[PDB]
Symmetry: D2
Subunit: 388 residues, 4 copies
C-alpha cells in the first residue's frame, strides 16, 4: 500500500531528464535551465539514489580548465550534502554541430580523433566521481542516404574507437565498464547498432569483450516494434545487462521518453517481473523528459511518478509469482518443462529413442491446449489488483 522510494531502491536520473527545457523540433523551450546542484537536491528529497550526466550537462561546452574545476567542485559538494551517488556517466557526442555526421564514425578522420579525446577526458572524470559504468549512445552514427556511409568501414571505425577506449581504461587500471545504448533512428535516418541484438553482436567482435555490455532503453526497442522484456532476457542470457534506461513510449513514432509506467503498461509489468526475478542489481535509471506542457511542479511530479510506478509494478509482479494459483497455472502451461533439457541423454540416445519420432503420437500432442489464456488473465488480474 505504501510506494515511497528510498535510496535503497537504486533509482537514478540523468541531469538532462528533469533538466530538459522543453525545446523540441517545432518549438522553443518552455522552462528555464536548472542548476545541476538544484536537481541533485530536489531528486534527493524525492527518494532517488543518484544521478548521471553527460560531460556537457555538468561542464558547459568550451569551458576553461578552471571554470571546469569550479563546476565539478559545486557538484561534488551537493553530492556530499545529500549522500547522492553517481553510478554512471556518458559523453555528449551529438549536440555540437561538429558531430553532425557522427563522433566515432564521422567520415572526417579529424572529428573521429576529437570525439575520442573528448570521451577519454570524461572517463577520467567519471572515475573520479565513482561511476561504475560508462554509457555510449551513438546518436549521430548513421545516415539519411545510402551512399553517405559505407557501413562496413563505419563498423571498423566503431570497433577501433571502442577498442582504444578499452586499451585506455585497462592501462590506467580503472574499474569501469562500458555499456552501448542502441536506438534505431532519430536524429539520424538510420542509426548504427539499431537494437539490443545488433549491439550484443558487435560487442563479441571487440578485442576485450568482457569490458562491454548494453544499456537498453524501453522506448528505443519499442521504436522498432520489438518486445522489450524479450530483448532484456537475451541481454541477461548473455550476461551483458550492465545498466538499463527506463521510460515509456507509445509505439512506433518519434522518441517520446515518457515517464516510466506510461506507454505500454503491460510491457512495463513484464519488464519489472523479469528484472526482479533475474536479480538485476544495477541502478534503475530513468531517461525521460517531463512533457513541455509542465512547469517545475509538473517536472517533480513526473519524476516521482517514475519511481512510484516501478514500486507498484514490483508489488504486483511479486504477488503474481507468489500466488499458488499462478504457480499451478505455470505448471499447467508446462513452463516447468521448458526449463528441463531437451536431450540431456545426448545425441545418440535421441537418435535411438523411438518415442521421439517413429512412435511419437503427433496427434495426441497437438490436441493438448497450452492454457496460456487463463495464465495471462491471472497476470492481468494481478496487475489491476483484481484478484478473487
Amino acid at each position: 500500500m505504501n510506494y515511497q522510494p528510498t535510496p535503497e531502491d537504486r533509482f537514478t536520473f540523468g541531469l538532462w531528464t528533469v533538466g530538459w527545457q522543453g525545446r523540441d523540433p517545432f518549438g522553443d523551450a518552455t522552462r528555464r535551465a536548472l542548476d545541476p546542484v538544484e536537481s541533485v537536491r530536489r531528486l534527493a528529497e524525492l527518494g532517488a539514489h543518484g544521478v548521471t550526466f553527460h560531460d556537457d550537462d555538468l561542464i558547459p561546452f568550451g569551458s576553461s580548465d578552471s571554470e571546469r574545476e569550479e563546476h565539478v567542485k559545486r557538484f561534488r559538494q551537493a553530492l556530499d550534502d545529500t549522500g547522492m551517488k553517481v553510478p554512471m556517466a556518458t559523453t555528449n557526442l551529438f549536440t555540437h554541430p561538429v558531430f553532425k555526421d557522427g563522433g566515432f564514425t564521422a567520415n572526417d578522420r579529424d572529428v573521429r580523433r576529437y570525439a575520442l579525446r573528448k570521451t577519454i577526458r570524461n572517463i577520467d572524470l567519471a572515475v573520479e566521481l565513482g561511476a561504475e559504468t560508462y554509457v555510449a549512445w551513438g546518436g549521430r552514427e548513421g545516415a539519411e542516404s545510402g551512399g553517405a556511409k559505407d557501413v562496413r568501414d563505419a563498423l571498423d571505425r566503431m570497433k577501433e574507437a571502442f577498442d582504444l577506449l578499452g586499451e585506455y581504461v585497462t592501462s590506467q587500471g580503472y574499474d569501469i565498464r562500458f555499456a552501448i545504448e542502441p536506438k534505431p533512428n532519430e536524429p539520424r535516418g538510420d542509426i548504427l547498432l539499431p537494437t539490443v541484438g545488433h549491439a550484443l553482436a558487435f560487442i563479441e567482435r571487440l578485442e576485450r569483450p568482457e569490458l562491454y555490455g548494453v544499456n537498453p532503453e524501453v522506448g528505443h526497442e519499442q521504436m522498432a516494434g520489438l518486445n522489450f522484456p524479450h530483448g532484456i532476457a537475451q541481454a541477461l542470457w548473455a550476461g551483458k545487462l550492465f545498466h538499463i534506461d527506463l521510460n515509456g513510449q507509445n509505439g512506433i513514432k518519434y522518441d517520446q521518453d515518457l515517464r516510466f509506467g506510461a506507454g505500454d503498461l503491460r510491457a512495463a509489468f513484464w519488464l519489472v517481473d523479469l528484472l526482479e526475478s533475474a536479480g538485476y542489481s544495477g541502478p534503475r535509471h530513468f531517461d525521460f523528459k517531463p512533457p513541455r506542457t509542465e512547469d517545475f511542479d509538473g517536472v517533480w511530479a513526473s519524476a516521482a511518478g517514475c519511481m512510484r510506478n516501478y514500486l507498484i509494478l514490483k508489488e504486483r509482479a511479486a504477488a503474481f509469482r507468489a500466488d499458488p494459483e499462478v504457480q499451478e497455472a505455470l505448471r499447467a502451461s508446462r513452463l516447468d518443462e521448458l526449463a528441463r533439457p531437451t536431450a540431456a541423454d545426448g545425441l545418440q540416445a535421441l537418435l535411438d529413442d523411438r518415442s521421439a519420432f517413429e512412435e511419437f503420437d503427433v496427434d495426441a500432442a497437438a490436441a493438448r491446449g497450452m492454457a496460456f489464456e487463463r495464465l495471462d488473465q491471472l497476470a492481468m488480474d494481478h496487475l489491476l489488483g483484481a484478484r478473487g
Copy 2:
C-alpha cells in the same frame, strides 16, 4: 539493355514460392497445387539456377518411407533433366498443429525432441541432394503473452537444439552450414531472435559458432522498420552472410513477400550495390508469394520479374560506382577518409596529439558540408537512368 537471366546468375526459388496456393488468413486458395516436378521445369525455362525446399514441400507429411522414396526419385529426375541444383534446404517446423507453441522451444519437451528428429532426417536428405546450406526459420518460437514463455529458458533450449545439430553434422562428416533466418513477428505475437542482430549475437554463444550464419530476408527486417542494407553490411562485416532471401515489403505490416524490386525500391538498389561490391558469391534466393489475384501465367510473370529487377539494379549500381563524377562526389563526402584508420598511430600518440583536442578548430570542422545530397541525387539519377 538485355536483362535475360542465365543459370550463371545464381538465382534460386523455393518450391513454396511459385507453389503458393493463395490461402491467406481471410481466404481460401485461388490456385491449384503445383507438382514440384513442374515447378522445376518451369523455373529452369525462366533461367533459374536452382530450387530450395522444406521437407514437407517435397514429401507430404505422414508419408511412408516408400512413398517418400518415390517423391525424391521423381524430384531427382527433374533436376537431372534440367541441370537445376538444390543449394539450400530447410525444415517445416511451423505448419503442423503439433508445433503450435514452437519446435525447438516448445514448452512440451516431447515436441522439442520430435522437432529435432524431423530436422535431422531432412539434413540427411539435403546432403544427398547437394545442398550446402541448411536454413532454420523458427516461425513458431515465441509467444502472444508474457507468462507463456520464459525467454532465458527458451534461449537455453534453442542453443541446445542448434548445438545438437552441430554435433550431428560434424559426427557424420557433412559439409553443410546452418543459417538462421530472423523475423520479428507473425505468426507468433513476438518471435525469438527477431532481427539479424539478435541472430548474430545468439550464434556467438553456440559451441561451434563457425558452423552458423544468418539468412536475412528483406521483408522481415523491414517489418521492424530497419534498414536492410545496413543489416546486411553488419552480417558481412562479421563473416556470417551464408545465404539471403530476396523479396519486397511495403513497410510495417504483415509479411507481404512481394516480388523482389517491389516494396522499397531504393533499398533494393542499395542492397544490390552492397552484395555486388562486397563480392557475395552465394545464391540470390527469392522467397516471395505471387499475389492470390494471379493465375498461373501471373505466377511465372512474377517469378521472372524477380530476376529481371535484380539484373536492372545490378546494372544501375555498377554504372553508379563506375561514374567518375560519382567517384569525385564520394571523395567530396570523405568516404575515402572513413576507410582510413582513426588512430593507426596508437593510443599514446592520440593522447599526445594536440591537433586532436587542445588545438582542434571545432568551428572550422563544423562548417564543412558533407555534400551528401548531391551524392544522393547522383545515385537517384543513375537508378532512374536519367544521367546527363
Copy 3:
C-alpha cells in the same frame, strides 16, 4: 469486487470468434469446427447478451434453399432456448476466391453485381432475426500494386454499392442501419477507407448519409498507429458510432485480434471511460480470436476474459471520474475551460477585444503549467487500484 457479466451489460460475440479454428497463414487448424448452436449455448452460459454472424458462418457457402432453411431453424431454436439476441449481422465478401479482387470494388463488373445480390440476401435474413445494424468490412477492397486499381473509380463503385443498399432497405421499409468497418491493410496490401476518418468522410458523400455509420475496431486503428479513443471521440462527435468491435492489438503488425484488455491496456481504459461517459448504448461486441495455442477450455476462458476486463476497466474509470481529487485536478488542468466557447461573444467582439491580442500577456500565459502529469498519475493510480 464482483465482475460477473449479465445480459444487461450488452456483451456480444461473433460466431467466427470463439469459432475460429486456428488456421493462420503459416499453419493448419488446431481446433475442430464449432456448431453455431453450441457457441450460442456456451456464450449464454458465460453471461453474453447475443451473437453476430456473417452469412457464411451460419449457412455454408453453396447451400440449397432447403439446407439453408434447416440451418436457420436450428439457430433460431438455440436463440429461443437461451434468450440470446442477434443485434448485428454482416456479409462474407472476402473468403471465396471469387472475391480475390474485392466485392463492391472488384474490377470485374459481374463480381460486383454478385457481391450486391449476396449482401441483399443476408440483409433480408438479418432483419428476420432482429438485427438493428448491418456491418460492412471491405477486406478485399484494395490493391497490392498501384496500377491495379484506380481509386477514384473504385470509390465511385463503392458509393454505388452502398447507395443501392440504401435504396433497398428504404424500399422494403426495413429499420436497419449500416456500419462501415475500416482497416488499413491485410489481407490486401492497402485497403480502401483505411481508417475511421476515411470512412466518415466517405459516408458524407452517399445519397442518404443518415443510414450509415462506422464500426471501428480497436486493433485496426492501432495497425495504423492511431489513438483509438481519439478516433472514437470523433465518430461520437459526428453522431456516427453505430457499433464497435472490441479487442487487443500489440502495435503495428498483423491483425492480432487478441482478447479485449490485452494489447494496449491504457488505451482500453481510456476507451471504456469514453464509451461510458458518452453514454454509448450499443452492444459491446468482441471481435477476437482465441490464440491457436488453446484448446476449447482456453477458448471459453479467453471469451470470459473479454467481458471481465471490460467490467474491471468500467469500475476503474468510474472511480477515477468520481474522485474529488481527480475532479480538482481536471480543473487545475483547465478541462473546464476547454468546454467553454472560445468566442460566444462573436467575431466583431473578438476583433475589438484588446485583451485577446494587443494587451495579451503572452509570457504570463506561457509560464502556466498544464499540470497534465499529476492528472495522468492519478489516472494510473486508479487503473492499478493503488489510490491513497
Copy 4:
C-alpha cells in the same frame, strides 16, 4: 532528357524549408539564418514559381507595426525583382511556448482567442500578397495523455475556430480558401485530425464546407503507414485537394521531410501519375528540410533535386500511360470495367437479373487471373527507363 524546371511548372517552396537552420531535438543549428530576400532570389534562379511563409518566418515574433512594415516591404521588392508569386501562406501556432497545449484547442480560453487574432492578422497579409490558399497545420492540437484533452470538446473548439475564420473572410469579401494539413503525431503524442480522412470528415461539419479543403503531405500519411496516392485520390474524389506538400519519408518514424523523390520512390511515381492524370492545377509545393549535414551548397542542391525528381517521374508516368502495351495490359486487368457502373440498370433490374446470382458461375469467375503482376512490372520497367 532535359529536366530543367521553369516557373510554368508551378514549383513552390516554404521559406522555412531552404531556411531550416538544422536544429533538431538532439542538436544545435548547423547553418546560419537566411534572409527571406536571399531565399527568394536563390529559388528564382533555380526555376521555382513562388514561395510560401508562416507569419513568423517573415515577421519576427514581437515585431512592432513599423518593423513589420519594413520586413514586408523588403520582401515585396524581392518578389517584384524576380517575378516570384506567393500562392499560399500559413500561421505559426506551434513555436512559441504559449502554444504548448495548442492554438485553436488549447485548454486555456485566452490562448484560443489569441491564436485566432494572430491568424486573422496573417490572413489580411496573405491576401495583400496574392495568396489563394491559407494552410492550417494544428501541430500543437493534441495530447500526450488521455485525461488532458476531451476530444469532443476539442473538436467543438476546432470547428468554432474554423467557422469564425470562415465568417471573417466572407465578411471581408476575400477570395481565399483554407486547407487543413493533417499529421498523426509529433510534436504532440497524438495530433487531432491525424490523417487526410479525419480532416475531410471534419470539414463536412463546418458551417461553410465549400471554403475548406486539405493540404496533405507525403511524409505525414506515411508516418501512419498509409498509402499516400490512395489518400490523394480520395481527396480528389471529394473535390477537396486545394494544395499539396511534397517530400520524402522512410516509413514509420519521426517526420523526416526528405527532398521529394527520396523515401518511397514508387509511391512518388504513383503520386505524380495521379496528379498529372487528374489534372491537378495547384502549386507543386515542397515542404522539406535539407539535412543538417549540408552547407549552403547542399541546401540548393537538395532544393533543385526536388524539382528534378518530379520532372523525371512526370516523364516516366506519361510514357507509361501512353504505352500501347500498357494500355492493353490495363484492359487485360479490367481497369476499363472498374470504370463502368455496376448497376446503371437499377436496383429492380439487378434483383431480377438471374445472371447476377442464381445462374452466376462463381467458379469460372474465380479462375480468372487479374494479370496485375505483368502490369506492375511494365510500370517498374517504365520507372527505371528499362523498356524493351
